[PDB]
Amino acid sequence: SIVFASIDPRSNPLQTSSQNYVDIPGLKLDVSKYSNSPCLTALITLNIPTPYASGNNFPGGNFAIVTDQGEQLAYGGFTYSSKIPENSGRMPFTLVARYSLASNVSTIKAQWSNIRGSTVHIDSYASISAVIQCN
Amino acid sequence: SIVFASIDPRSNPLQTSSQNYVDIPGLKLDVSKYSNSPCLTALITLNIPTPYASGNNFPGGNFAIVTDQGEQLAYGGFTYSSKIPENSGRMPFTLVARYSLASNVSTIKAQWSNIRGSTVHIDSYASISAVIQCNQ
Amino acid sequence: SIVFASIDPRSNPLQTSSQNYVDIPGLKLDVSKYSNSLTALITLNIPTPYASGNNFPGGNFAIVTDQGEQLAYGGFTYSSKIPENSGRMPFTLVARYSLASNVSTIKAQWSNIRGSTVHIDSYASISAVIQCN
Amino acid sequence: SIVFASIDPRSNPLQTSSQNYVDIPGLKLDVSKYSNSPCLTALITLNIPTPYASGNNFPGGNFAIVTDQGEQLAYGGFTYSSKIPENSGRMPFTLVARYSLASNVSTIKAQWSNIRGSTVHIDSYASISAVIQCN
Amino acid sequence: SIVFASIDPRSNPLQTSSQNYVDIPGLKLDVSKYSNSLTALITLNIPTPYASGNNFPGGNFAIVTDQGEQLAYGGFTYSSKIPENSGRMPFTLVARYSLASNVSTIKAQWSNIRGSTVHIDSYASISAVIQCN
Amino acid sequence: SIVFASIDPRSNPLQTSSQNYVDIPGLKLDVSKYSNSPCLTALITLNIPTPYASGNNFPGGNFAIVTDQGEQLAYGGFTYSSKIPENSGRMPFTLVARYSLASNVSTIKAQWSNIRGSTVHIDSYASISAVIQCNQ
Ligand SMILES: C[C@@H]1O[C@@H](O[C@@H]2[C@@H](O[C@H]3O[C@H](CO)[C@H](O)[C@H](O)[C@H]3O)[C@@H](O)[C@@H](CO)O[C@H]2O)[C@@H](O)[C@H](O)[C@@H]1O
Ligand SMILES: C[C@@H]1O[C@@H](O[C@@H]2[C@@H](O[C@H]3O[C@H](CO)[C@H](O)[C@H](O)[C@H]3O)[C@@H](O)[C@@H](CO)O[C@H]2O)[C@@H](O)[C@H](O)[C@@H]1O
Ligand SMILES: C[C@@H]1O[C@@H](O[C@@H]2[C@@H](O[C@H]3O[C@H](CO)[C@H](O)[C@H](O)[C@H]3O)[C@@H](O)[C@@H](CO)O[C@H]2O)[C@@H](O)[C@H](O)[C@@H]1O
Ligand SMILES: C[C@@H]1O[C@@H](O[C@@H]2[C@@H](O[C@H]3O[C@H](CO)[C@H](O)[C@H](O)[C@H]3O)[C@@H](O)[C@@H](CO)O[C@H]2O)[C@@H](O)[C@H](O)[C@@H]1O
Ligand SMILES: OC[C@H]1O[C@H](O)[C@H](O)[C@@H](O)[C@H]1O
Ligand SMILES: OC[C@H]1O[C@H](O)[C@H](O)[C@@H](O)[C@H]1O
Ligand SMILES: C[C@@H]1O[C@@H](O)[C@@H](O)[C@H](O)[C@@H]1O
Ligand SMILES: C[C@@H]1O[C@@H](O)[C@@H](O)[C@H](O)[C@@H]1O
């Protein structure tokens, strides 16, 4: 089966300047109905196709897929090559994780953080999804 | 099930300077066998791993996943951080969409458009794909 | 079904200056059980690579079978000749493979460009969804 | 998925002389977790491989598959050819039904009744099962 | 997936005295959508038939494709030459079919034995479970 | 998935007068590819549509579905209602069992045995089959 959530914050853009991972609002999958099932596995894809980061010390952004119990299943990020980009461009990002559904996990969700004091921004479509299958 | 289409236009590269979204040639999925299936969902992934854009005003490219009825299911894009890039680099791009097959749609396809007068280029492998699963 | 492999080479980063495609260690899927049948949709996710060099550096990646069949390839490059500090350029590649053949392994490979060195020092994955046609 | 129940009343045989359909104890499938699902269908098989009926007026037995709301999805039965069988033999019986799981149905179960005043008997293995699939 | 058909011919019972297999009306499965692919496991359920006659009567049943392929057959007969009142003899038959071919329909057929007349006057079904190998 | 085996021994009919259960030749399912699969269940159907039994003391036949480790998953049988049937009629028989594949078993097979000194006969099509499904 497929589980899916998307956001499109074009009229209310999101941002963070957090050095620690924090939730991206709306990018959460409710997997409660599949919880406590050792024979099920989720393949999760976080797709943030048009992010950017502003700043003056090689700005960038990090992203993670995490459970409601705070377990980090995957992480990665983008950065610019110049210390002070002329105009911080859009740097597509995708991340793929796997999770067994044996535990009482309720939610699988996206998080983000900054780098070198940047501000990360999302102002357009992004999604989190999973394919759930038997082992 | 899996539906898949790829291109590899190395000998006859593709480009667009269209301001409006137009089809990327060859990146279409035929889902007609699954049309009006109320219990099925498609997770669609557009993978353009090696595009670039030429131009002189912070060039880039936009991409979308669209039905044959013109419904835009997802969109996004890349841009460079310099006004006039020294040598427009390859900027990998992936886009993921969801589509309920409770519809009379026959085709899902990839679209692209330019930004600030750029030209977008594909000269190598790219794909569009879907995983089609029962909701239960 | 789902097949999956990941790496996270923080304490011993991976690098290549190979002009020809070479395996990325740890990013291999065993599809043994499904050979001679089914289609696999394969996603290579390298979310945080970079490449060092002084001539428009970048990195190429491929998904290959043990039969030597290149199913997909692509790469990233920088827009400057000599990047100030080669940035992280997220990369994802998606391939398909019919499991009608005698394939056992589907794996990731990488290569350099213009004499670069490609680097992975954090999480990356390869995965497949295997389904009936 | 498969749902399954069996009985083996070798040490506590079951019988009925009811002219109206009544439940066969233990031959019930709980389909609660699949209820209220218009996209799911059950294919149900009732297998009573070794029944017999006693009596003196062409004895036999009837069986049905029914929902907890009393909807009869299938029926059939066996009978002997002689008015007074010398020793009522075992007459294997199987019945197959289909049910959409759109409704709030909880249970799918077996029932039995007599014919011409017989007594129907089960004293060995019998089962009810279903294959549940998406439409 | 499940394909299913049933009949319940109480107000207009069905009968045959045909020595050759003939279709039982209403007991046909449309497998159109699955041709040229998958296996079907097909169950014919005739829970309450009987046969009239005076020379060890009985009835035969088969599962057949529209290509004329007999996938399974079997039948019931009585142990007495002239049954006092031909009793109900439950019948089930199970077949398999690979859907690699161009088949559209899988259906039930029946025939008599030793000049009997076979009868169905109550519920009966044909069904299939269609699955990937 | 489906696993299936059939026989049709018209030219070389099968019989048993064994008091103890023995294998019905040819009616075996190989489930070795599915062994030790904790999340899978098999629904097994033994279909013997046209057996008969000869004998002179209320003859009949017994049938079972058994694993290769000797575990009897289901059983049942037919018998005639007369001591000495005039002409032992064909008595259709079907048996359904469940088997969890959380086991190292490799084969599921059909078995038969006699009753009251009968001989059981199969001279025509018969099958054993399983539908194998994930529990979820
Ligand atoms: C910061 C700056 O953002 C982008 O330029 C914006 C432009 O953004 C639109 O296009 C991008 C794709 O490039 C995304 O879809 C955004 O969500 C869109 O809104 C607009 O916001 C206009 C105002 O209408 O302002 C421009 O500056 C981007 O093109 C630049 O490269 C850069 O990242
Ligand atoms: C080459 C350089 O690499 C990154 O800066 C590193 C920094 O890397 C961490 O952060 C990135 C995300 O940007 C990845 O998660 C790495 O796996 C991390 O290790 C650290 O390694 C520090 C150690 O002092 O060195 C920095 O240079 C990146 O942020 C830069 O933009 C650039 O790509
Ligand atoms: C009424 C009578 O029942 C059977 O004879 C029983 C015999 O039954 C066993 O065998 C049948 C299969 O024929 C079933 O598995 C029963 O559950 C078994 O118990 C035994 O009960 C013995 C005592 O041990 O008594 C016999 O009369 C059957 O064989 C007859 O044909 C008839 O239906
Ligand atoms: C030929 C005769 O048929 C049956 O007796 C019928 C009786 O049939 C009903 O019951 C059977 C189950 O035994 C089926 O459900 C039929 O569909 C029913 O109709 C009735 O039709 C009455 C009408 O007066 O006639 C009887 O003869 C059966 O019970 C006999 O054993 C025998 O096989
Ligand atoms: O940088 C990667 C790039 O390398 C060469 O230019 C190829 O012709 C392109 O299609 C692309 O593969
Ligand atoms: O009564 C049915 C019966 O008919 C003939 O005797 C056949 O040889 C048997 O195999 C069986 O099909
Ligand atoms: C247009 C050019 O295409 C290939 O040569 C890449 O290696 C370069 O980085 C640039 O994108
Ligand atoms: C042994 C005999 O076999 C076939 O000829 C049947 O038609 C008979 O009814 C009997 O079972």
Side-chain angles (χ1 to χ4, degrees), chain A residues 50 52 87-90 123-124, chain B residues 62 75 79-80 115-116:
Chain A
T50 323
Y52 63 102
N87 179 53
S88 287
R90 306 311 180 108
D123 62 3
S124 65
Chain B
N62 289 319
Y75 68 94
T79 66
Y80 302 105
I115 194 172
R116 291 178 297 264

Side-chain angles (χ1 to χ4, degrees), chain B residues 8-10 13 50 52 89-90 122-125, chain C residues 21 56-60 73-78 113-114:
Chain B
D8 189 16
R10 298 176 72 62
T50 328
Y52 68 98
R90 308 301 183 118
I122 293 163
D123 64 4
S124 66
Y125 178 88
Chain C
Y21 279 111
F56 302 98
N60 289 318
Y73 68 93
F76 68 95
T77 68
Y78 302 100
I113 190 162
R114 289 180 290 273

Side-chain angles (χ1 to χ4, degrees), chain E residues 52-101 103-129:
Chain E
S52 55
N54 57 10
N55 188 20
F56 302 98
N60 289 318
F61 302 98
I63 297 162
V64 315
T65 71
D66 74 290
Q67 305 295 304
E69 198 172 342
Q70 194 181 265
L71 305 183
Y73 68 93
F76 68 95
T77 68
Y78 302 100
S79 293
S80 290
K81 196 174 181 285
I82 313 178
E84 183 182 357
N85 177 32
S86 283
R88 306 303 182 114
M89 289 189 72
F91 179 81
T92 298
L93 187 62
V94 179
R96 178 261 286 111
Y97 194 62
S98 168
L99 294 157
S101 82
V103 59
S104 313
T105 298
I106 298 174
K107 67 186 173 180
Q109 299 195 314
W110 58 349
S111 68
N112 78 349
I113 190 162
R114 289 180 290 273
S116 69
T117 299
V118 198
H119 303 267
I120 298 167
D121 62 10
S122 61
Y123 179 89
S125 68
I126 190 173
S127 59
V129 180

Side-chain angles (χ1 to χ4, degrees), chain D residues 104-127:
Chain D
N104 182 227
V105 58
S106 197
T107 302
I108 299 162
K109 70 187 170 171
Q111 296 191 318
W112 60 348
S113 68
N114 81 347
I115 190 159
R116 295 179 289 264
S118 73
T119 298
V120 197
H121 301 268
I122 294 166
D123 62 3
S124 65
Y125 175 88
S127 67

